[PDB]
Amino acid sequence: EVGTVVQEEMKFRGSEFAVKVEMAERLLIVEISDVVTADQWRGEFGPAYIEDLTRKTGNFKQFPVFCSMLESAVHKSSDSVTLDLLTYSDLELLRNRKAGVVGRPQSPALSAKRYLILIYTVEEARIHYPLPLPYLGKPDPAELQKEIRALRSELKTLGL
Amino acid sequence: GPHMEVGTVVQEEMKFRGSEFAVKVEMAERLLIVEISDVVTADQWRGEFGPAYIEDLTRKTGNFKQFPVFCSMLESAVHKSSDSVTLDLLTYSDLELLRNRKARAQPQSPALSAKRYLILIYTVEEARIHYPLPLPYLGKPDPAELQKEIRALRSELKTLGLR
């Protein structure tokens, strides 16, 4: 069976995005779509990556705990977790602000990528876990129409 | 009397001359809506037809049908629920060749080239009557609009889970 999916729309630095998170026992999929342009970014994450990422960020979390935190953030179901969406440049700035450092190229793919930041509140502190999301481009009309037909048919079935 | 209810939508996939198409027929108020999508290319064609149009078309074709009767026939054809009706999908060229075969330069325009005709083929006795529905070409759909639709469908399915 397919893993647990949550998806909600929200605004990040001036624009509206759809945020989709799919969770399985050892797999986290994050898919973000610009609602207006249909641009998409997507990352897939396993336990080792996630557990390494949380450590490097400064506050280790086990893979299923991290995923539950992300789920709550998409649902806006806990004050302790929120989200942001950053370019590489903005994440560098954030890294510099957090380290109290002043602050000093970028490939096409790097400029195009985005980072979903899971922002976790502990005490009065904020911990910014960055999930890198490679740019996918825009999706295919034939493929989307296929999905649409399937969804309508399921609506049609369950109705009867 | 037979009729398609306003608000009803029938959509089924079927093959025309070896290729897969999605065939959608919707009943709006006094308006028959027919939309066809190439499953592989996402090309779309759509036409809308009122009562007077259909009654005139069926008469010109050689066998008058009242608008609601015609609508229910087409509905039955998409469902493939009746042996008396079947469907074909043709280009202007196809339609012109078959017209000549039954018993010269042709008009040429971008619109004419790109158009399709859904043929409602009705059998009575051993006679076959071919009602041609002209469907102007729309082009391919917009990804952002399709994604919007997908999110709305998923949300609705989710609320259906509560029942």
Author numbering:
A (entry chain B): 2 to 105, 110 to 165
B (entry chain A): -2 to 100, 107 to 166
Give the original sentences from the paper that presented this experimental model.
To further confirm higher-order oligomer formation of zCCDC611−170 in solution, we subjected this construct, as well as its F129E/D130A mutant that disrupts the head-to-head interaction in zCCDC61, to size-exclusion chromatography with multi-angle light scattering analysis. In this experiment, the His6-lipoyl domain tag of each construct was retained to stabilize the corresponding proteins at high concentrations. The results shown in Figure 2D demonstrate that the wild-type, but not the head-to-head dimerization-deficient mutant, was able to form higher-order oligomers beyond the coiled-coil-mediated dimer.
